[PDB]
């Protein structure tokens, strides 16, 4: 339900960009299609429409 937190989504994207995960880290953002989602977050993720 990450769409419930629009600004926190942008903050999460900012944290993700300046970071070096482990070779198997995988962040999943289950979400509902909504215009509230940041454009940068959409650009920085592998979208899966369900």
């Amino acid at each position: 339900n990450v769409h419930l937190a629009p600004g926190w989504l942008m903050q999460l994207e900012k944290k993700l960009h300046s970071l070096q995960p482990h070779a198997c880290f995988r962040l999943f953002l289950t979400m509902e299609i909504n215009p509230k989602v940041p454009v940068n977050l959409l650009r920085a993720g592998r979208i899966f429409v369900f």
Binding site: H17, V37, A44, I47, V49
Partner: protein, 400 residues
């Protein structure tokens, strides 16, 4: 002979550095051709094959830039060159965001800090940077704060033993190590003429011609390594190979002076003179075999031109998909990952050695992979639309 042409070469290079920063790659090339045509028509001597990226920078700096996460593209190398030889503080327009990371990595040894005009603490960060010396990268120049006008104008007054710069109402000092890079993540934006005059724009946006050239270079590197090596040897033919020859001459001079009459005692220096002779003969052979290699790499590039055009068309279709639905925001990095999967890690390409057949397989798999990656993140009603767009792209690409 080089003395006979240095004036025109420097004229063209300085014009390219000063102007031609904001323009895309095609407009930069058009302007450079216009200036070269004028200089030729005015009987001003200039080198006919001036490569800007290797006349304004050398191999050590380019290797450092690549190590600092600068994409290996002609446009990006030219932009990095303009970011090095700048008289006015540059303004970086990078929607992708790679150039900010490039600057961060390049000046990390100088303790560069990142700030934005939107942040209210921008004034204090700028004051500290100016007063102490660490470089500053200011972001979001669309909201440019006019306190930076004296900084951009270099209005420094030296009273007593202080080099002051009146930042707003204050009179803070200036440190010699200070340097500021404005930045923008928005390509489409209008700037005031004063701001345009006080900064040198460094445009990092990817256009149709830019992406076509980048993809052509990548396919040439991946599928025709010999052609890519011959193309790079043409570029290394000016500057780099000559510098290697001068380094060999310096080594010979150092070794020759070292012998205390051992020029005949050991009879081993002749190995060094023959090695230098062979290397110089290699350089001369490559220099004389320049037109042939030019035409050869031109034909080989023409082989993959439809593939590069298809790549550019596919990426800009992906970009324009944002109008269909708000979820359809795809990045240049996304398309480049698709292209990496198409070129390398391709199961269909295994066991295939014919170059034309490999090109056909790559061209087919490009569309296949593009659809498989995009349509997964699309509503089922848009699958047919995207397939139709890709079909139109393929129909444009095919011959016959």
């Amino acid at each position: 002979n080089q003395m006979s042409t240095i004036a025109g070469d420097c004229l063209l290079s300085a014009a390219f550095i000063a102007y031609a920063g904001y323009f895309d790659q095609q407009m930069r090339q058009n302007l450079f051709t216009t200036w070269s045509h004028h200089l030729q028509q005015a009987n001003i001597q200039f080198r006919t094959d001036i490569a800007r990226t290797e006349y304004l920078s050398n191999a050590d700096e380019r290797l450092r830039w690549q190590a600092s996460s600068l994409p290996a593209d002609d446009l990006c190398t030219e932009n990095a060159i303009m970011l090095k030889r700048f008289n006015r503080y540059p303004l970086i327009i990078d929607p992708s965001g790679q150039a900010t990371e490039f600057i961060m990595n390049e000046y990390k040894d100088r303790k560069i800090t990142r700030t934005s005009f939107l942040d209210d603490a921008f004034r204090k960060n700028l004051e500290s940077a100016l007063r102490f010396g660490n470089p500053l990268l200011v972001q979001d120049v669309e909201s440019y704060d006019p306190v930076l006008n004296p900084v951009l104008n270099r209005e420094v007054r030296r009273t007593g033993g202080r080099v002051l710069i009146t930042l707003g109402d204050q009179d803070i000092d200036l440190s010699p190590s200070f340097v500021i890079f404005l930045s923008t993540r928005d390509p489409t934006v209008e700037f005031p003429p004063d701001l345009c005059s006080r900064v040198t724009f460094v445009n990092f946006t990817v256009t149709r011609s830019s992406l076509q050239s980048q993809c052509l270079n990548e396919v040439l590197k991946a599928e025709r390594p010999d052609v890519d090596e011959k193309r790079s040897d043409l570029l290394k033919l000016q500057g780099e190979f000559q510098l290697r020859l001068r380094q060999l001459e310096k080594s010979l001079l150092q070794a020759l002076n070292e012998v205390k009459g051992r020029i005949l005692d050991d009879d081993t220096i002749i190995t060094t003179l023959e090695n230098l002779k062979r290397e110089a003969a290699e350089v001369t052979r490559k220099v004389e075999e320049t037109d042939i290699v030019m035409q050869e790499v031109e034909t080989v590039s023409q082989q993959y031109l439809p593939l590069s055009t298809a790549c550019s068309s596919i990426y800009f279709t992906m970009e324009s998909l944002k109008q269909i639905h708000f979820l359809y925001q795809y990045s240049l990095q996304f398309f480049l990952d698709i292209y990496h999967n198409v070129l390398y890690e391709n199961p269909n390409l295994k066991g295939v050695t014919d170059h034309t057949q490999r090109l056909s397989i790559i061209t087919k798999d490009l569309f296949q992979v593009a659809f498989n990656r995009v349509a997964r993140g699309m509503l089922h009603q848009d699958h047919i639309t995207f397939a139709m767009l890709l079909a139109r792209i393929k129909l444009k690409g095919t011959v016959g």
